[model samples]
Target: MMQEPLTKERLISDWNSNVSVAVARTTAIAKSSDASLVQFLAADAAATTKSTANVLKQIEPLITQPAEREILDKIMQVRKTYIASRDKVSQLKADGMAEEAESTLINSYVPAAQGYLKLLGELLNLQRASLDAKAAEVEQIESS
Candidate 1:
C-alpha cells in the first residue's frame, strides 16, 4: 500500500520542469528564419543538423554566392557543436552532470541559431537587392 498521495507541490514542480523542456522547442523556432529552422525544432537534433549540413543536397543552384556558402558552412559547424553537446546528454546524466549537459546543449544551440538566422536574413536582403537593381536597369532602358 502506497503512502503519501502525490502532493500539490510535487505536481507543480513536475509541470514547471516540463515547461522548461517545452521552452527549448519554441525558442528554437523563434530564433530561426529559414525552412532549415525545422532542424532546431526536431526531436533528433543530430539528424536535422547533419541533413542541413549537406549544402549541395539542400541548396543546389540557389546558393551560388560565395559569402552565403561560407556563412552556411560556418552554421553547419556550429550545428555540429550542438550535435556533440546533444550526444553528451546521456553520458552527462550517467555521470550525474545532467544540468551541465543541458546547459551545454542550449548554449551551443542559441548562438548557432542566432548566427544562422542572421546570415539567412542577409541572403534574403541580397536577393531582394539583386531584383531591385535589375528592375531599376529595366526602367532606365524603357525610359530611354
Candidate 2:
C-alpha cells in the first residue's frame, strides 16, 4: 500500500481516490443485471466497506484545525444516513429484487448520496484552499 505524508495535497488526493473507489463499486453493483454477479460483488464490497468515519480515524492525527474537524464530523453524520440507505439498496440488489432496489435507490439512497457527496466536495475544496494558502506562503518566502 502506498502512503503519502499528511499534507493538504495528499489529503485531497487520498479523498478523491477514496470516493472514486466507492463510486465505482456502487455504480457497478447498482447497474449490473447479473444477479449472481451483483450478489458476489455486493458481498465482497460489504466485507470491506469504507466510510468517512474509517478514513477520519485513520488520519486522526492530521486533524489539527477546528474547521477541518467540523467538516469531518459533518461528513460522518451524512455518512451514517448514506450507509443505511446504501446497505438497504445493496441488500435488495443482491436479493435480485430490481424493482424494490430501484425504488429504494430513488427514494432513500439518492438523497443520502447527495448529502454525502456535497460535504465531501466541500471538504476537498477546503483542502485545496489550504494548499493554495501554503503555496502563497512559499511564494512570499522566495520573493523575500
Candidate 3:
C-alpha cells in the first residue's frame, strides 16, 4: 500500500505543534537548571522557538499557494542557522570560555540570529500580505 500525500496544512500544523512542544521543554529545562547563564541560554532558545512558531502560524494559510513554499524553505534554512548559532553559544559558555562566548555573540552568533529573526518576520509579513491580497481578489471576483 502507498501512503497518502500530506497536505501543506497538515505539514505546517505538525511542524508548529512540534516546535511549540520543544519550546515548552526548553522552558522547563531552563527553570530547573542551576546555572544562571545556562538558564538564560535555555530561555533564549525557548524564545527563539516561540518566535518561529509565530512566524509559521502567520504563514500557514498561504501554504500550497504560489511563493509560499519558497518562503517556508527560507524560514527552515534560517531556523537551522539559528539553532547552530545557539548551540555554538551554549557550548562556548559551557566550556568556561566566557570572553570567547561573549565575542562570538558580539561578532557572529547574535548578528546571525538576529538576521534569521528578521527574515522570519519579513516572511510572516509577506504571508499576511498575500492572504489579504487573496481575500481582496476573491472579493473582486465575487463582485464582478
Candidate 4:
C-alpha cells in the first residue's frame, strides 16, 4: 500500500518553521561584523526584494482575494519603507551624524528591517496555508 499523505497542519507547520529559520539565518548573516558583511547584506537585501517580487508574481491568481491582497500590499509597502529608511541611515552615517545615525539605525532602520521580516512571515504563512489546502485536497482525492 502507498504511504499515507501528510496532514495539512503538519505541512504548514513544517513550512513555517523552515521559512522562519531561513529568514533568521539571512538576518544574522546580514548583521555580521565581518569585512564582507556589507556586501553580503546588500546582496541579500536585493535578493529578498526580488524574492518578494517573485512572490507577488506567483500570487497573481489571488490578487482579488482580500486576505492575500492585503498581505501582498503590506509586503510592498514594507519593502519600500525599508529601502528608503536604509538609504537615509546610510546617508546619515556618511555625514558623520554618528549619534543621530545610531539613533536612526536603532529606531528607524531596525524597525523597518523587522517589518520586512514580518511581511515575509505573513507571506510565508499564506503560502503554507495555500500549499496545505492543495495537499489536503490531493490527499483526499487519492484516498477515495
**Per-residue lDDT of candidate 4, residues 19-127 (tens digit):** 4554443444334345355456556655765665664565455445577678767867876776676656545544555466556666776787677667667766766
Who is ahead in lDDT, 1 or 2? 2
For candidate 2, lDDT tens digit of each residue in 66-132? 8878987887787778778778878777777778877877788777777777777877777777767
- Locate the minimum summed-lDDT window of 10 residues in model 4: 1-10
- Tell how far residue 14 is off in model 2, in angstroms: 3.7
- What C-alpha root-mean-square deviation, in Å, does candidate 3 show against the real structure? 8.2
Winner of 2 and 3 under lDDT: 2
CA lDDT for candidate 3: 0.57
* Alpha-carbon lDDT, every model: 0.48, 0.71, 0.57, 0.57
Better of 2 and 4 by TM-score: 2
**Worst 10 contiguous positions by lDDT, candidate 2:** 1-10
lDDT of 4: 0.57
User: Among all windows of ten consecutive residues in candidate 3, which has the lowest summed lDDT?
Assistant: 1-10
TM-score, ranked from best to worst: 2, 4, 3, 1
Q: Would you estimate the TM-scores of all the predictions?
A: 0.45, 0.75, 0.56, 0.57
Clash tally, candidates in order: 0, 0, 0, 0
- What lDDT does candidate 4 reach at residue 114? 75
Off by over 4 Å in 2: 1-8, 47-54, 138-144
Clashing pairs in 3: none
* Residue lDDT tens for model 1, 1-144: 111112222332343343345347534443334435434354444454344445335344444568756755664565455445545543454455545645655676455545545555554455455556656777788789
